[PDB]
Amino acid sequence: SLALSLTADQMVSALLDAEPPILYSESMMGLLTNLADRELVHMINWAKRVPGFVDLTSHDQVHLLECAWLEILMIGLVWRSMEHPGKLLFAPNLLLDRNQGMVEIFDMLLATSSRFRMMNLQGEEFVCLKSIILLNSGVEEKDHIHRVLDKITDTLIHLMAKAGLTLQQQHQRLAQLLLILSHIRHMSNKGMEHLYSVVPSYDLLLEMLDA
Amino acid sequence: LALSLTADQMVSALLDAEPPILYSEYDPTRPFSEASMMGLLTNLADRELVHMINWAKRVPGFVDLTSHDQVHLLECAWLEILMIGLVWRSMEHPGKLLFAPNLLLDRNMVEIFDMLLATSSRFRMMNLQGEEFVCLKSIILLNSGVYTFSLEEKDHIHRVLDKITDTLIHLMAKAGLTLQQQHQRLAQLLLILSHIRHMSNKGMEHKNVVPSYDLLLEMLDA
């Protein structure tokens, strides 16, 4: 695979160019649903640019997206709201605070954003985490996925070492970031059930990917 | 002082703090019904929650927290902790879940069963060690509920979490793994915790469900 031959800088470079744009919004449910739908179209294009992803069968690509799509939207939102304490930046024209807040998810999203802030999470680290979520949430195929995940781990470590972190600080920060993903999974699952009152089907995601 | 222990002392403390393996109610009516099954699992979990409290209070740094914060962490992690314990017990039993030594069940509800099976085979594949297991379980306890905690208490937990990370890496280096393999294995282990969170959430949704704040507090003060 070409993904397995990528260096850390190349992995970072690839993920950075694959970044979807920050979309604008056009009731709260309507605006967010409209935003989420348009975001999903970009997520498909982004996923197909994640190194090692298209090497998977179309069936495996769908399953990964079906499991991780809300986590990816959420970590995006959290990343966007990082420099706006006490507020969620769904869109540049849709900045919501706690009072406008569902409130349980809101607080957890706020807590994740504040966590990214105190860790001063970098954009290079962020795109690494986002692709990790894609490949891990729904995980020869499983073997290949785990190899790519090792690459992203090596990529994360290289970024930290280049930033001047000691070997100890490197495994600690690596641990801190990956444990945040556990909280992201939790927010996603709670969001899913609160959503059932709307979700991308297997067939829908397969059709979008085939474009 | 938890933050003063060495890596070997951390492992030693975690191993000594391990809860015992419990049996489900002896001689239940077989085969099972959906009710009688859940009746046995509920009974087993309720008896396990008691020993988990004892284990929790022996986890380095946990008793340093206020009772309120201790309850919160347990309120968030208790099902995760029961599940990773289940997955650990089931490692040497391919295609089976070992809820109890007298309660070994195969696939033949089913979605969670499959998820637990996959995780167990994942542990078996990685050759997960006991010293690594108790570290992961301690991480779950301290991490699952940390994300809504005063600032000195949240900072303290992260230091203990950093300590267990050091302990994991120390175990891997001591075993002979290269620095790259150490990073990779550490990552693979913590990513599984995300799956465990997922299984816990699916299980939760599946009159007395939550352990209740008051019960957990009472068991803690005792």
UniProtKB/Swiss-Prot annotation, chain A:
Compartments where located: Nucleus; Golgi apparatus; Cell membrane
Annotated ranges, domain NR LBD: 7-211
Positions of modified residues (Phosphotyrosine): 202
Domain of life: Eukaryota
Transmembrane regions: none
Chain intervals for the UniProt region annotation (Transactivation AF-2): 7-211
Lipid linkage positions (S-palmitoyl cysteine): 128
Protein family per UniProt: Belongs to the nuclear hormone receptor family. NR3 subfamily.
Subunit structure: Binds DNA as a homodimer. Can form a heterodimer with ESR2. Interacts with FOXC2, MAP1S, SLC30A9, UBE1C and NCOA3 coactivator. Interacts with PELP1, the interaction is enhanced by 17-beta-estradiol, the interaction increases ESR1 transcriptional activity. Interacts with EP300; the interaction is estrogen-dependent and enhanced by CITED1. Interacts with CITED1; the interaction is estrogen-dependent. Interacts with NCOA5 and NCOA6 coactivators. Interacts with NCOA7; the interaction is a ligand-inducible. Interacts with PHB2, and UBE1C. Interacts with AKAP13. Interacts with CUEDC2.
Domain notes: Composed of three domains: a modulating N-terminal domain, a DNA-binding domain and a C-terminal ligand-binding domain. The modulating domain, also known as A/B or AF-1 domain has a ligand-independent transactivation function. The C-terminus contains a ligand-dependent transactivation domain, also known as E/F or AF-2 domain which overlaps with the ligand binding domain. AF-1 and AF-2 activate transcription independently and synergistically and act in a promoter- and cell-specific manner. AF-1 seems to provide the major transactivation function in differentiated cells.
Protein name in UniProt: Estrogen receptor
